[PDB]
Design a protein around this ligand. Structure first.
Ligand SMILES: CCNC(=O)c1cc(-c2c(O)cc(O)cc2Oc2ccc([N+](=O)[O-])cc2)on1
Length: 213
């Protein structure tokens, strides 16, 4: 009988409130979730790029800096993979749910006042736009300073962090979106290309799309 070690966490109260607003409100332009996840990947890639200038050894865990987009119709998932700096277990805990960082509170209050979802990434909470289209999100991540971990949440006020012994990452972050039944358009090649073109043209790392036959 194999094993993983897991810990359950409560979302910080304002993040939980924010996620509820995201999950339960109609917004047009839900398509921006992908721009936000790509931009998160870009930010993480910048960190390893500039850190590599003074310490090339940080690239031992993977030299190519790039982004992969992987839709899977049968799994009903859209996966975004990057070879950015990655997150430690403590990074996952501190940055993906237990602390209301940056513009978390400001943006929550803005949505409360009936604001658009569009500027979510400017407030430092772009990751949570995933829940515009996903019922469940899994984040696999590997940083040079720690082991590989899986972060997991279907919202409802909690998330888990566990050891992960699947396919090795090397270094970076994979975000797996389990799509809602009425959001399956984002599994289609044409739609992904449309939204990358409209919102992610200036991203300064190579993006590869894996088109299903
Ligand atoms: C502390 C050093 N690590 C990072 O900054 C980092 C960030 C990411 C990353 C990613 O590569 C892709 C994503 O979709 C998200 C990522 O991290 C986060 C976590 C939370 C937010 N947020 O909006 O609250 C954004 C990016 O990976 N490593």
């Amino acid at each position: 009988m194999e094993e993983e070690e897991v810990e359950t966490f409560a979302f910080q109260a304002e993040i939980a409130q924010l996620m509820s607003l995201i999950i339960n409100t109609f917004y047009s332009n839900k398509e921006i979730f992908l721009r936000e996840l790509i931009s998160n990947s870009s930010d993480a890639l910048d960190k390893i790029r500039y850190e590599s200038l003074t310490d090339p050894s940080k690239l031992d865990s993977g030299k190519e800096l790039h982004i992969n987009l992987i839709p899977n119709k049968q799994d009903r998932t859209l996966t975004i993979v990057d070879t950015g700096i990655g997150m430690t277990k403590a990074d996952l805990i501190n940055n993906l749910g237990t602390i209301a960082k940056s513009g978390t509170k400001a943006f929550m209050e803005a949505l409360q006042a009936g604001a658009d979802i569009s500027m979510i990434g400017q407030f430092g909470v772009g990751f949570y736009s995933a829940y515009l289209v996903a019922e469940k999100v899994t984040v696999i991540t590997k940083h040079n300073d720690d082991e590989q971990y899986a972060w997991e949440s279907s919202a409802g006020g909690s998330f888990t962090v566990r050891t992960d012994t699947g396919e090795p990452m090397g270094r970076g972050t994979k975000v797996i979106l389990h799509l809602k039944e009425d959001q399956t358009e984002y599994l289609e090649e044409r739609r992904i290309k449309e939204i990358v073109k409209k919102h992610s043209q200036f991203i300064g790392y190579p993006i590869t799309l894996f088109v299903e036959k």
